[PDB]
Amino acid sequence: VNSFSGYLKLTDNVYIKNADIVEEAKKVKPTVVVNAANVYLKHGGGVAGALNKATNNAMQVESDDYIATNGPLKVGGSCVLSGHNLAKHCLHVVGPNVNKGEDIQLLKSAYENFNQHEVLLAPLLSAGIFGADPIHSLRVCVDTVRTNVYLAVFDKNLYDKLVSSFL
Ligand SMILES: CN(c1ncnc2[nH]c3cc(F)ccc3c12)[C@@H]1CCCS(=O)(=O)C1
Numbered sequence: 001v002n003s004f005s006g007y008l009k010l011t012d013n014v015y016i017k018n019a020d021i022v023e024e025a026k027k028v029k030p031t032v033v034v035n036a037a038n039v040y041l042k043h044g045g046g047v048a049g050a051l052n053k054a055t056n057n058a059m060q061v062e063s064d065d066y067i068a069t070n071g072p073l074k075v076g077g078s079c080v081l082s083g084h085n086l087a088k089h090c091l092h093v094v095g096p097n098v099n100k101g102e103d104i105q106l107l108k109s110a111y112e113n114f115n116q117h118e119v120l121l122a123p124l125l126s127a128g129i130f131g132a133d134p135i136h137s138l139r140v141c142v143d144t145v146r147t148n149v150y151l152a153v154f155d156k157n158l159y160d161k162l163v164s165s166f167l
Pocket of ligand 1: 049155
């Protein structure tokens with residue numbers, strides 16, 4: 001039993017809710033919140049900008065030190081950093097950004113990072129400003145992640161479309 005509330009069950013291990021991931025993280029304080037990161041961990045907009053704003057920019061300060069030490073992530077890769085006031089840990093995962101021309105096949109590799117964590121609160125990778133089809137992202141999530149994932153979808157209209165079209 002866990003504290004996630006109001007989710008619709010899609011499969012054995014994948015759950016979905018119309019919610020603001022920032023507000024959901026603040027309430028649940030999950031072990032892991034996933035960020036929709038880029039390779040530079042520049043948290044300017046989308047989910048990343050919202051999560052970073054909620055940490056009063058502490059996420060960005062920590063991220064800049066990480067990049068100065070380690071260099072950029074790979075598209076499809078991830079790193080574990082602090083969850084600050086939102087979660088124990090933040091798993092920063094880089095899905096391909098279609099608006100930069102990155103290979104959508106890398107979306108499966110991105111979701112594989114979730115399997116290193118037993119339970120996660122997450123957005124749909126490569127959705128939103130990353131330019132992928134969120135219905136495709138949900139399909140890859142369900143077909144790739146084997147651990148327990150609680151997906152937060154900000155847009156109510158999109159949430160309803162994702163549920164109604166789910167096979
Ligand atoms: C981006 N995205 C999110 N997913 C969950 N939580 C969020 N919080 C946010 C705060 C922002 F400022 C921007 C965005 C999000 C967000 C999802 C991708 C398609 C649109 S969506 O919004 O339907 C779901």
